[PDB]
């Protein structure tokens, strides 16, 4: 019952810290989670949100959804078949995803078995005191203690949870959690939200809808994918619309009622209505702090609800740290993992390292997908006197032949024009998430535009466009956009 | 007519040089090529080998071949359709490719039309004297003179040409040039060679082969794709085999004869026999210097037939330069382009610059593909006391579900273990050519393994493997491998 490190949440951040502490520094590690494998009732499990109801199953489902485009696009390359025989079997996809995720859950059980000191505990972690975590049978703090763990160090890694707007009929709606387990593909679906989860799921549902199907994505403001490059936001909107998805912007559900046939009658704030089979809310995720009983030891939360941390993931309470989505910053698996790896290399390695939250490569598995690293030009323009924007945008040749002429590839490099330093790279098109990874390494190395354009292209690729841009398309000078420098 | 620059060959390097000299440096420029659009009889044409019978059309055709895998792989993700209705219409692929290539031909025609001081001459360029290019009707130097171009400066940019082994039946075999114009997809084809062109065409033919068809690749040496990472050579051999391609290593054609039905009867040096509809020779490309009459000016050639150049692309004759494949160095379009730009910057800009032929990112559009930049470990181990190999090899998760369990992604980083400097990155799997591009920029910036590992992954990707390797898999110490 005595551990160097007790981790609450066997997720992206929690397991990296757990496994590292044990294998690298022969530390004695306890990890708590509420469930050992994916799905209802608690959805996240051993492996965390990404593994169970996040990056992993989503990527499999987007890959499945991509075949709608491949099957059509093949005809341009001379592939012939009975188009009238094509069916998308959602049930097959969900059974395949379930088996793939279960194998990962079991893979992690294997890890915790084949690794000394590293031990898993099942049930709900909360803080008794500075150096004791209690594992209960439920999230009710009045339920039975299963174990009481002694810890020289406590890591909060409980991740996040979908936010459900408190509207009349919210109980008729789902989150991404339930989306992963729908027994049938919805004919008509409303994805609510303008973020990556709503966009990715609109693509998934769009590919698997039965005949006479319709995917509607609504977003409360004017343009989806706030925080992404503006050119790409407008382009993804176009490319989703070109593939049959209806984008309702400046619209937001005010209430949902059940129709007598079990379908959902959505009333918008604007007074518009829409009947759908599924309303999937994807309006935000919020840190999971409630259940930890942080009041007991007085861990400070933020004006937003995330565990407040310093650059070393340290709470106001010594020996207590927080990584990943509970900190309510960048909600990404590799950031959680980076933070856990840094926390452990610091505390147990005696080799203090802090996660860099700048110049983080990330993606949206939209069809086609986004790959991005570093600053969008609007943000660059407010920090740097002179910003240059290099832009190349064209339908790649293969997509003129494929018949998907609407698949414009967008490559944008944003620089500090004073020294040529690359501040951000923004890609939209097939392979963008793969292209951007090594760009993250370039930005860590303070790559300039001349490092890109003096590197020899790989031909033919979309990526080589990044090594072909010598001349700014336009500038920001003290915030002001203009074609030419003064 | 008198020009600041005359370019023989309107190809990757020749057009970069001529356009740059004309537009950036305001020189009067002549460019010569033998054809204004793709295909027989001369195959290459305005635009070069890559445009007409290389990178551009082959990438379109590999993209076409990939649908064979997508169609099969769709089933794992629940896609259903009538498999027995599936046909790979090669005629449609070829017609689509020909239109794409002709559009590029037309756009280059328009470029010459619209760019003052940049003039195109049709026919066969050769050196009359060190300041005179003669353009003639045919490759025969006694053919009719169409033009005589006076040149302060002459650029040789005629590219390379398929090598055909002087064997009995050579006339019954084709090269990549003819492969691009086969009217019908061969049922049975032998690709001869272990290089990228043989492997890439084996994958193209494997996808479009009619029912009961068979693609065979043959290579003299023990393992295809010499020059590439050895783990990738072995894995790409396994993955081609898994997709139904017969890889015959340590085998070479001795002769070819016609079966009575016009099919090709192949006798290998081993006494094995194979009957095929097509024999495609992809055993090497040689520099195209024969037709240039370089003996008229005494430009120094290698016994091979390449034009010898310094690092600034200068021949032994002042005012005569050579770039691209004719130099028989790195036969890649972007290298030819880089050499042409560097030459023109040096000569007309007084901006002295030489092409770095190290750490050049390149790809093989095999199925699945290869992306690579910098040194393989065997080469690094000879030039560095201590070399570290970081290796990750895993059947990715989409490929458990897809049914292509054989499709292992291989990511390998080779370092100078003394300082961590990355010497080489080698990738096999979907996306590798796209991933490796920005790795080229990393190696220009002297990235170390710590710069990869400390970079935050993009998840889920294959690329994030590059940023997830903390610890060497093995080492070379003084040329010796140590586990
Ligand atoms: C639909 C979706 C798609 C996503 N796609 C991507 C993507 O493509 N790429 C990407 O980088 N990120 C993606 N993310 C984000 C990613 O899932 C998270 O950033 C990541 O999982 C956060 O890791 P973490 O360590 O903070 O916690 P998590 O991985 O969320 O782990 C938290 C764990 O703690 C457990 N837990 C919670 N409370 C308790 C308690 N009291 N006691 C015990 N255990 C508890 C939970 O059961 C859970 O397993 C996606 C998220 C979602 C929802
Ligand atoms: C099948 C194949 C696939 C390839 N794939 C790739 C790939 O994916 N990526 C890559 O980077 N590289 C690839 N390459 C290599 C690339 O095509 C060459 O490296 C590049 O085209 C060489 O450029 P260059 O300027 O040297 O000559 P070229 O582009 O070959 O141009 C030479 C030109 O000169 C003309 N010519 C020749 N003799 C004369 C004469 N006497 N007078 C006038 N004109 C003449 C020819 O008609 C031709 O247009 C491929 C090559 C082949 C054969
Ligand atoms: C590749 C790399 O940087 N690895 C590393 C990072 C931190 N601490 C130890 C190691 C071995
Ligand atoms: Br060999
Ligand atoms: Mg254990
Ligand atoms: Mg002109």
UniProtKB/TrEMBL annotation, chain A:
Record's keyword annotation contains NAD: yes
Active site: 459 (proton acceptor)
Gene Ontology biological-process annotations: cell redox homeostasis; cellular response to oxidative stress; glutathione metabolic process
Residues where NAD(+) binds: 193-200, 284
Residues that, per the record, bind FAD: 59, 125, 158-160, 325
GO cellular component, one term: mitochondrion
Subcellular location: Cytoplasm
Catalytic reaction(s) noted: trypanothione + NADP(+) = trypanothione disulfide + NADPH + H(+)
Residues covered by the Pyridine nucleotide-disulphide oxidoreductase dimerisation domain: 360-466
Pfam families according to UniProt: Pyr_redox_2 (PF07992), Pyr_redox_dim (PF02852)
Cofactor section: FAD
Domain FAD/NAD(P)-binding: 3-340
Enzyme Commission no: 1.8.1.12
Alphabetically ordered keywords of this record: Cytoplasm, Disulfide bond, FAD, Flavoprotein, NAD, NADP, Nucleotide-binding, Oxidoreductase, Redox-active center
Subunit relationships: Homodimer.
Role according to the record: Trypanothione is the parasite analog of glutathione; this enzyme is the equivalent of glutathione reductase.
Protein name, entry field: Trypanothione reductase
Organism field: Trypanosoma brucei equiperdum
UniProtKB/TrEMBL annotation, chain B:
Active site: 459 (proton acceptor)
Residues binding NAD(+), per UniProt: 193-200, 284
Family annotation (InterPro entries): FAD/NAD-bd_sf, FAD/NAD-binding_dom, FAD/NAD-linked_Rdtase_dimer_sf, GSHR/TRXR-like, Pyr_nuc-diS_OxRdtase, Pyr_nucl-diS_OxRdtase_dimer, Pyr_OxRdtase_I_AS, Trypnth_redctse
UniProt catalytic activity: trypanothione + NADP(+) = trypanothione disulfide + NADPH + H(+)
Stretches assigned to the Pyridine nucleotide-disulphide oxidoreductase dimerisation domain: 360-466
EC number: 1.8.1.12
Enzyme class: oxidoreductase
Domain FAD/NAD(P)-binding: 3-340
Protein's cellular compartments: Cytoplasm
Keyword set, alphabetical order: Cytoplasm, Disulfide bond, FAD, Flavoprotein, NAD, NADP, Nucleotide-binding, Oxidoreductase, Redox-active center
Disulfide bridge map: 50-55
Names of the cofactor(s): FAD
GO biological process annotation, one example: cell redox homeostasis
Record GO terms (molecular function): flavin adenine dinucleotide binding; glutathione-disulfide reductase (NADPH) activity; trypanothione-disulfide reductase (NADPH) activity
Cofactor binding comment, as recorded: Binds 1 FAD per subunit.
Quaternary organization: Homodimer.
PANTHER family membership: GLUTATHIONE REDUCTASE
Protein name: Trypanothione reductase
């Amino acid at each position: 019952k005595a551990f160097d490190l007790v981790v609450i949440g066997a997720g992206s951040g929690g397991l990296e810290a757990g496994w590292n502490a044990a294998t690298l520094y022969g530390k004695r590690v306890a990890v708590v989670d509420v469930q050992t494998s994916h799905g209802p009732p608690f959805y996240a499990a051993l492996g965390g949100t990404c593994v169970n109801v996040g990056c992993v199953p989503k990527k499999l489902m987007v890959t499945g959804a991509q075949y709608m485009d491949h099957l059509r696009e093949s005809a341009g390359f001379g592939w012939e078949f009975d188009g009238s025989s094509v069916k998308a079997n959602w049930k097959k996809l969900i059974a395949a995803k379930n088996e793939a995720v279960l194998d990962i859950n079991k893979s992690y059980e294997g890890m915790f078995n084949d690794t000394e000191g590293l031990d898993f505990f099942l049930g709900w972690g909360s803080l008794e005191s500075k150096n004791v975590v209690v594992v209960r049978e439920t999230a009710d703090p009045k339920s039975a203690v299963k174990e009481r763990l002694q810890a020289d160090h406590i890591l909060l890694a409980t991740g996040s949870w979908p936010q459900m707007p408190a509207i009349p009929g919210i109980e008729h709606c789902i989150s991404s959690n339930e989306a992963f387990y729908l027994p049938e593909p919805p004919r008509r679906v409303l994805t609510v939200g303008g973020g990556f989860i709503s966009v990715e799921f609109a693509g998934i549902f769009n590919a698997y809808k039965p005949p006479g199907g319709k995917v509607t994505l609504c977003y409360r403001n004017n343009l989806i994918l706030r925080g992404f490059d503006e050119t790409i936001r407008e382009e993804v909107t176009k490319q989703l619309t070109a593939n049959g998805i209806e984008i309702m912007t400046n619209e937001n559900p005010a209430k949902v009622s059940l129709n007598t046939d079990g379908s959902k009658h959505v009333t918008f704030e604007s007074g518009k209505t829409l009947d759908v089979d599924v309303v999937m809310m994807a309006i935000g995720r919020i840190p999971r702090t409630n259940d930890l009983q942080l009041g007991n030891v007085g861990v400070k939360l933020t004006p937003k609800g995330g565990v407040q941390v310093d650059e070393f993931s340290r709470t106001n309470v010594p020996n207590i740290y927080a990584i990943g989505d509970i900190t309510d910053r960048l909600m990404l698996t590799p950031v959680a993992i980076n933070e856990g790896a840094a926390l452990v290399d610091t505390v147990f390695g005696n080799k203090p390292r802090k996660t860099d939250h700048t110049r983080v490569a990330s993606a949206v598995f939209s069809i086609p997908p986004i790959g991005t690293c570093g600053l969008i030009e609007e943000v660059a323009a407010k920090e740097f006197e002179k910003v240059a924007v290099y832009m190349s945008s064209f339908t790649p040749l293969m997509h003129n032949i494929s018949g998907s002429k609407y698949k414009k590839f967008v490559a944008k490099i944003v620089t500090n024009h004073s020294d040529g330093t690359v501040l951000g790279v923004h890609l939209l098109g097939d392979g963008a998430p793969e292209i951007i990874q090594a760009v993250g390494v370039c930005l860590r190395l303070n790559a300039k535009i001349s490092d890109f354009y003096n590197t020899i292209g790989v031909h033919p690729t979309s990526a080589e466009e990044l090594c072909s841009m010598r001349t700014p398309s336009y500038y920001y000078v003290k915030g002001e956009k203009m074609e030419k420098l003064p």
